[PDB]
Amino acid sequence: DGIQPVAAIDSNFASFTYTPRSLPEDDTSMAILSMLQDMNFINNYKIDCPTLARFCLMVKKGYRDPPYHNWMHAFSVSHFCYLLYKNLELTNYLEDIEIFALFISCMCHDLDHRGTNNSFQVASKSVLAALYSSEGSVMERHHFAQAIAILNTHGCNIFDHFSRKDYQRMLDLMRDIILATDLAHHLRIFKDLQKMAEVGYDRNNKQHHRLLLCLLMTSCDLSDQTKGWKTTRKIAELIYKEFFSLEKAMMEMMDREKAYIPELQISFMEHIAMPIYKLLQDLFPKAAELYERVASNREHWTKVSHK
Numbered sequence: 359d360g361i362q363p364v365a366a367i368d369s370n371f372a373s374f375t376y377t378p379r380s381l382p383e384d385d386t387s388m389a390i391l392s393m394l395q396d397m398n399f400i401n402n403y404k405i406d407c408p409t410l411a412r413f414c415l416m417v418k419k420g421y422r423d424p425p426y427h428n429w430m431h432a433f434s435v436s437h438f439c440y441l442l443y444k445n446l447e448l449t450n451y452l453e454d455i456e457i458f459a460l461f462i463s464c465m466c467h468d469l470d471h472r473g474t475n476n477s478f479q480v481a482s483k484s485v486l487a488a489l490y491s492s493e494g495s496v497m498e499r500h501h502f503a504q505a506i507a508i509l510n511t512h513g514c515n516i517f518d519h520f521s522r523k524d525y526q527r528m529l530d531l532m533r534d535i536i537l538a539t540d541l542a543h544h545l546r547i548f549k550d551l552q553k554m555a556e557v558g559y560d561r562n563n564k565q566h567h568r569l570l571l572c573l574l575m576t577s578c579d580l581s582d583q584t585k586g587w588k589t590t591r592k593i594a595e596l597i598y599k600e601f602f603s604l605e606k607a608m609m610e611m612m613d614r615e616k617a618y619i620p621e622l623q624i625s626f627m628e629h630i631a632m633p634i635y636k637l638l639q640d641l642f643p644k645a646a647e648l649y650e651r652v653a654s655n656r657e658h659w660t661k662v663s664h665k
């Protein structure tokens with residue numbers, strides 16, 4: 359094969375309107391390579407292509423498949439990462455190595471998702487946000503360690519040619535970015551994010567770099583919310599299907615429990631999702647489209663919510 363150009367996957371691959379979940383699963387590894395190519399990482403870092411193929415195949419293979427926290431989730435978060443690169447022009451904000459770390463983090467950040475819901479930090483703001491949230495910041499996870507175990511598998515070391523210093527910096531970035539997916543982490547840095555958007559992003563501030571990378575990471579994880587109505591509806595279904603994945607009903611109870619979805623999804627939008635994409639828009643005028651679209655989904659949910 360060799361790598362496909364992004365524009366050959368779909369004329370709209372690079373548009374916020376595009377739904378990556380509609381790519382057949384078998385074409386997703388190739389589409390990862392297409393995106394790294396169009397982002398100029400393969401060329402600039404002179405990455406061996408067979409190696410990058412094996413790496414990508416290896417992380418895909420390492421995902422469990424619950425209804426929601428699965429490869430397609432990872433794939434679609436990665437794809438949003440690419441959309442932020444293309445549409446917000448992140449190279450004017452972050453360094454190449456940070457963008458690269460962000461992308462690989464998207465690919466890797468749910469490898470050790472367990473679904474053990476053991477915390478009240480997110481739940482206090484939104485009961486459904488707690489089910490969408492990745493884990494690792496309150497209970498220890500090994501999304502990161504698993505990513506490296508892959509990296510150190512013969513024939514998979516895509517950062518082989520980096521300097522020792524960039525190699526540590528790459529690993530530190532992944533470890534920190536993967537941790538930041540956990541919404542408990544986001545809540546804990548929220549005031550800092552707010553301060554950053556108030557004062558204005560400062561390319562020379564290393565703190566601003568760290569904060570932006572977390573914000574972007576969480577913006578990719580919840581990016582299902584920035585798609586069509588059908589997408590939040592389908593994703594809400596999946597989260598449910600996951601959490602009920604095993605206990606004697608007192609069919610019936612299942613339906614009472616899905617009658618709660620609208621209000622939970624609205625509370626999730628109002629208290630967690632929308633603030634995040636408000637922040638992006640405050641920092642990036644070109645992200646207005648995204649907040650508007652989440653806003654519009656909150657409207658449909660409200661509208662539906664009188665089942």
Ligand SMILES: [Zn+2]
Nearest residue numbers: 431468492579
């Ligand atoms: Zn995730």
